[PDB]
Design a protein around this ligand. Structure first.
Ligand SMILES: CC(=O)CC(=O)SCCNC(=O)CCNC(=O)[C@H](O)C(C)(C)COP(=O)(O)OP(=O)(O)OC[C@H]1O[C@@H](n2cnc3c(N)ncnc32)[C@H](O)[C@@H]1OP(=O)(O)O
Ligand SMILES: CC(=O)CC(=O)SCCNC(=O)CCNC(=O)[C@H](O)C(C)(C)COP(=O)(O)OP(=O)(O)OC[C@H]1O[C@@H](n2cnc3c(N)ncnc32)[C@H](O)[C@@H]1OP(=O)(O)O
Ligand SMILES: NC(=O)c1ccc[n+]([C@@H]2O[C@H](COP(=O)([O-])OP(=O)(O)OC[C@H]3O[C@@H](n4cnc5c(N)ncnc54)[C@H](O)[C@@H]3O)[C@@H](O)[C@H]2O)c1
Ligand SMILES: NC(=O)c1ccc[n+]([C@@H]2O[C@H](COP(=O)([O-])OP(=O)(O)OC[C@H]3O[C@@H](n4cnc5c(N)ncnc54)[C@H](O)[C@@H]3O)[C@@H](O)[C@H]2O)c1
Lengths: 290, 288, 289, 289, 288, 290
């Protein structure tokens, strides 16, 4: 028995709502700024489940049971008796401090405040609050990836972190404790990978398909780093690289200019149909270097 | 086709098996001492009997592979070789004189390839009478499917192409690489291990946590700290130092934590202790 | 052909001359203040007078090229031009806004070219209706024979080629260059100037010594410190900053001596004081005396 | 005056010419192998023959300067010289040893000067009995008018001045420079070449484009890639490495494309292949074709 | 001599006392609001009565210092000032327009000086009709003896010399500085505090241990982590960021540990918690 | 009651021997490679004490009592029943591993092995030993500076560190625990100070006397950083800067070229009569920039 409020109905908010709603005994309030926005979020969840049912990867009952646990609305209306708040709204500092400032008055004292941010400081978001703010970082798709990075801020008490650890185990995830630093663990290791592969291509060491083939066969990775950058989104990789660079001040994390040029041109990868690979209707992908 | 493998260590053994695996290939497994070459084939042979007993290879096929491998010295076995793959000790002068001697022994049409990962292909074959190309295998070479074909500064495109064709003939996937420090895999893979150590060093997370996050968050087969322990932390340290000295870029500075562990003999699996202690059972315990 | 030059500074003037000195071209000069745009065609008439007096130009030729330059009001005239060359301030949102207010004013079929020194061609032309290409001139634009032709990711070959033909049609040599911070010349030339300032700041030599060393040792036409003053030290600083921010590499960090000089208005020739003081006798004097 | 040149490569030859082409001087050329030292005076006689045939030199003048260059055996002749100019391999212990074996051979009162490109003047001359001064020539030494005069911490003014007088006495322009890695010209010029290689390696432009850009855009006499081949790419690499190690600043990290070319013997003009291939037709061809 | 001090905060108060301490000087303590200037003098006055009660100053001398200080607005009090020392809010546009207004108010021979530590002296007085020089005091200005005289790009040597003479006239030791980020003291002192935080962050030692080692090993009066807490970690962070952005050199990258503490409001003494917790007694406890 | 063996009779070895011999109940075996070398070491200790007696800063009895506790000789002869070994010989890796390899056979099992190194790895020195190797770092002059940095290597057990902590407190010093990293704590902070001051001078920001005056009055430091570099020895500052740079690979610790040029010229500071200041017979020092 647990009531979970997810603030933000975009991609990540939908996946987090699904992650909690999969576990029996959990109810999710999927909130956003405008009521229609949260309705579109749940409709996008409903539309996604109808596809998995057609492809025979989920029973219709389970999809219906999951959807019936998610209620769209406003945090003023649905988050009073919540036990956990996981915010997953737009990555803007002021918006996050405003959301949690309002939630501090709406929610009961026992409610735990968590944020799914990846680019902003857990410490700075929850500065003026009356209760701890902790990082609960999921990975796309949140309902299937089993990792959760638990982020301890400068003033987050150890009990707050432990509670998030139990909640993660209860929903069938594997919590990993991270003391707040740019990129945490996964992003800090994974995104410089893609960056290095781009440097390799830009410097003419090898070609795109070669670079990806080498990392798949030589390191037994599931995807090549350039394939992965297209899938993750090159605009997101560029932002992570720049955040790592600005937080540390270390030229080690300087972004590859080839990546910066591609983002400027709108070649963001899978979501625009073209990145390091061109994605064609026949489900064929070809490297832009032919 | 007849191949000469120079160096009967672990890598040379794997390369010999990779070529002898394919019907119609003969391999000359050479070293500086005849006994070493015969010991290399003995290690190759006994490894195949464990495979036969495990029922994972016909007894006659294993007998055929071993029969296709001849041990000895390069002066005696490499005159009519079609391809030479060097996999001896990683020293520039050792490799240079080895290929200067092979330059006089081998017939003109014989191709000279090297398995080096850290030394410059271009510098290896600087003053030779024929091109030098890189044919970088991955351990275990008989099982791993990737072959990095390293083009030197003066390697003709025809030599690169023939190595590509040989790679597919033995069932591998060649990827052309213009010579640079760390090639492709090592340039991307080892700084990853280096980054994870930095994360540990700076107190961001714990060893087991770091490794857990990479397999469950990035879908990797092994965590980077386990991987560094498996590769061996002395190898990782040496690769980082090569990348640093070849580029002059502080981006590749090795994590001082790793350098401290290498100095204490904590190299990983090969010594039983790295980021993990490897107990007599099968479990491994992080030194955290 | 009708050409519209956006900007009336040292380079807007030279680009105008570069087109007007070739027969059958007509140029529309533009700036912020009409007074400054009129100061443009004024400083052009002024320089051709000295050249005619020195016998280097026939007065008939000079009067003919000055008759092909018509100072618009920032536009009104920039409406029928077959080619646009902007030479405004090296700031990003400045060039978007300008090209933004320009996609309306000019004719539907008309080529848009930017004379930017190091900025992204792709980002400058984003919301535009037509391609945006880089056409980089070099000070002095009427004399230097090189044109760098830079294409964005979304720049067709028909526009890159048309720029190449227009370049040879006015007696220039176009070299195509892929999009990167500083392209070729500026990426090489400006850190050279930056290095020269570092050498002065660390006291390895004085201003005079550094410039005669590079002139008498590398056969360079101007010392790197004169060339800094000639280009405009504000321009050099802006290019180093773009280099540093685009690559993230401290290799391109601007020399603090130049940043101090730009903060004081010691920009070089265009303010009479940079690394040299420019006296009315037509002589220059190093500020370190 | 009697002058002893230590080294018979491209610069030992040019420094010899620079002194011998001025009346009343006599030069002693030296190298490792007498065959190589004799190859020195041979390649000098060879070049003056082509100049005389081209009418650029009177044969009487050329024969007079070739008569002032006497190839010693690495010394025997370097004993009465009033000035030593070493132009040996740019390695530190190489120059100590050479100047070490030289403090005996030469006369007690005789000036020791090094033509080093970037190495510490102070460290080169440490155990010596006399001061050690830097006298830096520039390829081609008989034509380039600049001489960099570099003093160590323990170098008196009488020696720095005597070098300044000898410089003007042979028609050169001496500029004094404080001791630092690369002095002035090389610190500015070689990273310029290094940058040009980075631009090629990252595919911004091809070899031809880069060199015509700097020639037609900055009025440079040679493109930075030709100049790399002309200087010797081994020399450029050594200078970048000295720069990187002396400052510890990754700003001066040598371009990996140059290090790859030097490892292959593609040194430029002196091996017929660098960034260009040098054909017998007297034409050069970019290796990227 | 008559001095105008612009800004009645802590620094402006100290500079006013430093000049009014010396017999024959009058000071105009100005701000943007008349009440603020009067509150600055009130803080100056009450600080002197605690000194009289402590027996560390004659009652009449303290009465004379306070009497030499007049509060108000610069338009009313600064027309006949001989020297202007600005110590208001550190914003480029604020300081620029302040000196543009003073350019019209003050008599031509009046010298314009600024106490800024992070903003460019050269840029402050860019378009003025008279030179702008830096006169950087150290808190408490009436007690600390060092004065950094900052020469701008266009500051004449005569203006630098007159500030040197004024500094010795009021009993200080002027040190000429050609404008660069961090001048001398801040350029050396703050990266030291930054380094100690890096040492803590990387697990090399503990806070108390770090601070103990610096006073007992280097004979310093305060440990760097205590010093950062005393200076205030927001000030240290801002100085590191200025040094980084002005030089573009990664050598001055601020320690991410400090940036995390500043984000949590743990600024040091001014908030009661930094690297040390400052208890109600007098002891301080490291957050280790 | 404690027997202490000090290996190395140079400057640091003498000061360490004096540090232990000052405390009642301690006996010091001051060893070196050649017997005459250790005799010269004790003679230098004796000669130094005769000067302090003349200047009236120590009683002759105390000097005599301290000297009577120090015995010169060879480690093969004097270190069998030692309770602590503090090596302070020349900073060369192989020499240190050889010394401790030999001492492992000579000394009783209870003997603690310590090294006063500042530039070399505690972990690497004691790699193949049969007992722990720990860092016990003193500061010149060791008999008066109260700080001791206790250096834990990769395999140093916590009890070894604690024993060194007690020994330091027993001899009236203040131990600080340091986990092995280049420069430890003090050198890593202090030497970049001097380096930065040299950069300030080289870049023409201020003059030598100004830089030192500013740090003395502005930061309340006892010595200016350039004064301090001359006193410490510029050759030593250059070596520390280079060790920090090579261990980390971080351009942040790159040595100032002005310092490198001065070391090449023999201007090492106080010990050569000239560094950033010229030291004249009349005890007057003048900055080399006049
Ligand atoms: C690395 C370090 O440590 C220091 C260094 O060296 S850094 C590099 C320094 N050197 C440079 O930078 C060189 C840069 N490049 C240049 O300056 C120019 O490209 C260049 C001067 C070499 C151009 O070559 P050039 O002008 O054709 O040679 P130059 O001799 O000046 O002129 C050609 C003429 O030689 C003339 N000539 C007359 N007398 C001559 C003589 N005694 N010797 C040689 N040439 C003579 C001829 O007239 C010929 O011209 P024509 O064929 O048209 O009649
Ligand atoms: C920052 C960016 O984005 C890109 C950039 O701009 S980077 C910088 C690029 N620009 C450069 O590098 C310039 C470098 N410097 C140089 O090339 C040379 O110093 C220089 C060409 C400017 C030298 O000046 P110069 O040679 O005296 O001017 P130049 O016109 O070529 O020759 C002088 C002659 O003008 C001649 N002349 C004849 N017709 C002329 C005409 N229509 N216009 C101008 N000059 C004419 C005259 O004959 C005069 O010579 P005399 O007085 O002896 O008779
Ligand atoms: N040596 C050089 O000057 C160098 C050479 C080639 C190209 N670059 C680039 O050319 C462009 C201009 O160079 P410059 O020498 O004329 O600089 P400049 O300092 O002389 O002034 C630029 C001119 O453009 C005007 N301007 C600014 N914003 C404008 C706008 N929005 N619309 C119209 N006019 C505007 C300015 O008032 C000024 O007249 C820059 O992008 C520069 O990076 C200049
Ligand atoms: N473009 C240039 O070549 C450039 C220009 C000016 C100065 N620099 C410096 O001049 C010196 C030589 O330049 P280079 O062009 O002749 O190089 P190079 O490659 O042409 O050969 C140098 C010559 O000196 C010989 N040599 C090497 N060691 C010697 C020794 N111990 N004693 C006598 N001879 C020895 C070599 O055999 C060779 O003949 C170097 O220090 C270089 O840094 C060269």
């Amino acid at each position: 028995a647990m009531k979970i409020g997810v603030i933000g109905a975009g991609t990540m908010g939908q996946g987090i709502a699904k992650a909690f709603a999969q576990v029996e005994g959990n109810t999710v309030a999927l909130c956003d700024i405008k009521q229609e926005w949260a309705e579109n979020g749940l409709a996008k969840i409903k539309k996604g489940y109808e596809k998995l049912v057609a492809k025979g990867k989920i029973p219709q009952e389970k999809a219906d049971a999951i959807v019936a646990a998610i209620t769209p609305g406003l945090k003023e209306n649905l988050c009073a008796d919540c036990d956990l708040i996981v915010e997953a709204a737009f990555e803007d500092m002021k918006v996050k401090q405003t959301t949690f400032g309002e939630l501090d008055k709406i929610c009961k004292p026992e409610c735990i405040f968590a944020s799914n941010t990846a680019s902003l400081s857990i410490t700075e978001i929850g500065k003026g609050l009356s209760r701890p703010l902790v990082g609960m970082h999921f990975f796309n798709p949140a309902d299937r990836m089993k990792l959760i990075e638990v982020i301890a801020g400068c003033n987050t008490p150890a009990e707050t972190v432990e509670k998030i650890k139990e909640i993660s185990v209860a929903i069938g995830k594997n919590p990993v404790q991270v003391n707040e630093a740019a990129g945490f663990v996964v992003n800090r290791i994974l995104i410089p990978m893609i960056n290095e592969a781009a440097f390799i291509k830009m410097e003419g060491v090898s070609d795109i398909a070669g670079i990806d083939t080498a990392m798949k066969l030589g390191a037994n990775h599931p995807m090549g780093p350039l394939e992965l950058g297209d899938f993750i989104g090159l605009d997101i990789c560029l932002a992570i690289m720049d955040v790592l660079y600005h937080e540390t001040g270390d030229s080690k994390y300087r972004a590859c200019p080839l990546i910066r040029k591609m983002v400027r041109g709108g070649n963001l990868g899978c979501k625009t149909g073209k990145g390091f690979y061109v994605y064609n209707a026949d489900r064929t992908k070809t490297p832009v270097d032919q």
